[PDB]
Amino acid sequence: EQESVKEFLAKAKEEFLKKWESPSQNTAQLDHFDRIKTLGTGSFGRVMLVKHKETGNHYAMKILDKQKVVKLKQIEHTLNEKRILQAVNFPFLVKLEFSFKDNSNLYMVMEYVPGGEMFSHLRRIGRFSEPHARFYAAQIVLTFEYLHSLDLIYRDLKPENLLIDQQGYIQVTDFGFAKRVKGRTWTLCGTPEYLAPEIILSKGYNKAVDWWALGVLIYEMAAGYPPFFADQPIQIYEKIVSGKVRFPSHFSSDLKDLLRNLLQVDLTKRFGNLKNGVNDIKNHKWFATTDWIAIYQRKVEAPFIPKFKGPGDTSNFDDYEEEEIRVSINEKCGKEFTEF
Template identity: 65%
Template sequence: MCSVRGAQVFFLYILVLYSYKPNRHKISTGPLLYSIMKRVNSPESPRSPPPAHSTVSTHSYQSAASTPTESSSNRSYLRLNKSTGQSPSPSPSSQSVQRSTSRSPATPTSSDTVKRSFFRFNSTPLSGGSNSTYSNSFFNPNLTMGQTGSNVKRSQSDIQTFLDKEKEKFIEKIENPIKQNGRLEDFDLIRTIGTGSFGRVLLVTHRNSTHEKIALKILDKQVVVKMKQVDHTLAEKKILQALSCPFIVKLLYTFKDSSYLYLGLEYAPGGEMFTHLRAFGRYTEDMTRFYAAQIVLAFEYLHHLGVIYRDLKPENLLFASDGYLKMTDFGFAKRVKDRTWTLCGTPEYLAPEIILSRGYNKGVDYWALGVLMYEMSAGYPPFFADQPIQIYEKIVSGRVRFPNHFTVDLKDLLKNLLQVDLTRRYGNLKPGVRDIKEHRWFRDMDFIAIYEKSIPAPFIPRTDRENYEIYEEQPLTVSSTERYPREFADF
């Protein structure tokens, strides 16, 4: 008994050692077998959410007496696997998103350290007043879902036929991936819009006649190898180039040189949901439904192809100019036939089966959908704590408390998504995603109209201003000798 107990403590220690950072973050390790100790099932009730107008520290939700800090997250295009380790200095709260005018990605300033924790600026959704960043000309709080004029009901067989054809196209592209179709010299570099452990993302324009804007993701080969992310990087490129979904960023260009790997991604000028959700405080239920429907369709598409995403969160959802979403960062995406065991993702969004190392499949994405829907509707996630291990314990316990403003239908759907028992979790049962799409919370939702983007978006981001953080620029130093030719031969 003592040896078993000692093993449990040891594995918990290893998990925390791998995953602890001051802010909400990603973790990525190899398979890790461990058990959550008995305190997971203790009768202690889950921690209450912050009261109205409360704030949090950089270590997730803590004291309600602290002052909101200026922060932003720039991990949508580029995965960050290391936090800065610095705590932000407090500053007065603001309804609008504050941004720094200059920041070196290597040494972020204390006022805008990249964070994963949400900062709840207000207790009610922003209504778009005249002095608000989100004016009434861009935000329609009276949107009613289903107002499209053509609520065409497609049979399930039609949808299945469509998805089967998409799978054929996907397999063809996977088996015949695109070759290098660009060079760094083909682009004019504008500025950095994201940084991370592996490199940076630059906003660039192509020197062709269209001068299209591209988000150029630049990965340092040496760092990718050092962080043991070669397989994830190759999988990201291979999967992205084969996808075709209106709610997923397109991979337009791919190439490499002696030092770097380059992914030219579709540019989403509206910025991250993370930034806008902080400014709103929380979304109305109709807004949550509008965005959740797009994620449901994206997951229905991916899962039919045999791909699981494993990294859903507001930072990885970008706004296009039309107000619809673009899912990005496929570094953790994987083709799975049965189950996989890799421990990866963001702590607050990890499904119980990932934490318990039981093997998992597409069900983890639907768990994450439940977390995202909760976070959009409440302004904070359903599972939060000061330390990652406390978050894991709450997730495995499965106890969820809902704010009073959640409707009965929303709570019912979330209970079925945030279901620890995989045999009862919506999306993972025999009907598949239909359990979600046909739930009464989506009663008036026309998913075909969402797919065709014929429903007006409830919020149109302003594109006449920068929606991404400002960084101090750093030169790209390309080695004269080829680095890691064997590791990246298939890129």
């Protein structure tokens, strides 16, 4: 990195630490918003499109049921997610605008990104050209350079978590597994196709798992399917730990070389985790045409501009059963979520 990048990252870490040490809390409430539509769902939570009543602005509100968070043993992960999101700031990360809790739920009110998930766009077109995959990959490389310099591991890279904005740039969402780690960590988390071998083998692992996941993402963007695909998790895990991969013949030689270095089973040999860190990736011949500054400054014309009618359009997200959001008259799990 040149000194200007070093100085940028030093400032970025100072600004992160100030918010990390003194987190914002309780900056909105539920009856300040109208409920519009469910944008996505899960085991302990739900993401809703909402409209702020006074300003008219739209947001994506993630709602977690405290009792379900406790039962699924996600308390620490949920506290990590909110504490990290209120402290980070980067062009390719979805912004947290407000957060609050009530007797029943935890709420994170995020910017709403109307272009949909990368996953939908990838599945609909089949695969991305190498330049198109490279444009998105470059944004992930910069985002992981930022997060890793703050000692954060992201741990949930997959196409569903990359939203496409109006300008065709990626914004990364879902910090549910992100953690501040200055050395190793041990939790089994992540989607099967994206897990590094050291996670599957129950080892203490580090930020190298995010570089592995980038290799899986680039492969899947350029092929249309992930490199260790199989019908059941145990078979996926066997392929991941094997040390072999098959590349489509249409992949360029430079793409294959980059992917063999990201998908290196030995974490001590994996690109992103060597002495030169991220620069082995940024200087790789597959990225030779990438202007890293221009990508950061959002000056590159994107390959694809999502079609949508306005900031309240939900057409790029799919339809889910609409369930209500209840708030008990009795406080649940107050102690567990005191810091939220």
